[PDB]
Chain A
Amino acid sequence: STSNGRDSQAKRLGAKASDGELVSGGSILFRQRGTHIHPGTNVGRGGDDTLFAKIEGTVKFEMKRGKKHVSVYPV
Chain B
Amino acid sequence: MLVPKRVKHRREFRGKMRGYAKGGDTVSFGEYGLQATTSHWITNRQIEAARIAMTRYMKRNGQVWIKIFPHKSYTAKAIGVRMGSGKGAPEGWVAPVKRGVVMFELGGVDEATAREALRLASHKLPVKTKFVKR
Determine chain A's interface SS by DSSP, over half rule: loop
Determine chain B's interface SS by DSSP, over half rule: loop
Question: Contact mask A61-73 → B, CB, 8 Å, 1/0?
Answer: 0000000000000
Within 8 A of B (CB), among A12-39: none
The CA-CA distance from A31 to B86 in the complex, in Å, is: 35
Distance (Å) between the CB of A44 and the closest chain B CB? Answer: 40
Contacts of A2 in B (CB 8 A): 86-87
Chain A contact residue count (CB 8 A cutoff): 2
Residue A8 at the B interface, CB < 8 A? no
Question: Contact mask A1-16 → B, CB, 8 Å, 1/0?
Answer: 1100000000000000
Distance (Å) between the CB of A2 and the closest chain B CB? Answer: 5
Distance (Å) between the CB of A6 and the closest chain B CB? Answer: 14
Contacts of B86 in A (CB 8 A): 1-2
The CA-CA distance from A1 to B84 in the complex, in Å, is: 10
The CA-CA distance from A4 to B86 in the complex, in Å, is: 9
The CA-CA distance from A45 to B110 in the complex, in Å, is: 71
Distance (Å) between the CB of B29 and the closest chain A CB? Answer: 41
Within 8 A of B (CB), among A32-66: none
Distance (Å) between the CB of B74 and the closest chain A CB? Answer: 20
Distance (Å) between the CB of B92 and the closest chain A CB? Answer: 22
Distance (Å) between the CB of B85 and the closest chain A CB? Answer: 8
Question: Contact mask B81-104 → A, CB, 8 Å, 1/0?
Answer: 000001100000000000000000
Q: Which residue of B lies closest to A4 (CB)?
A: B86
Distance (Å) between the CB of B10 and the closest chain A CB? Answer: 14
The CA-CA distance from A2 to B11 in the complex, in Å, is: 13
The CA-CA distance from A1 to B86 in the complex, in Å, is: 6
Listed A/B pairs (3) with beta-carbon separation below 8 Å:
A1-B86, A2-B86, A2-B87
Chain A to chain B: the 3 pairs with minimum beta-carbon distance, closest first: A2-B86, A1-B86, A2-B87
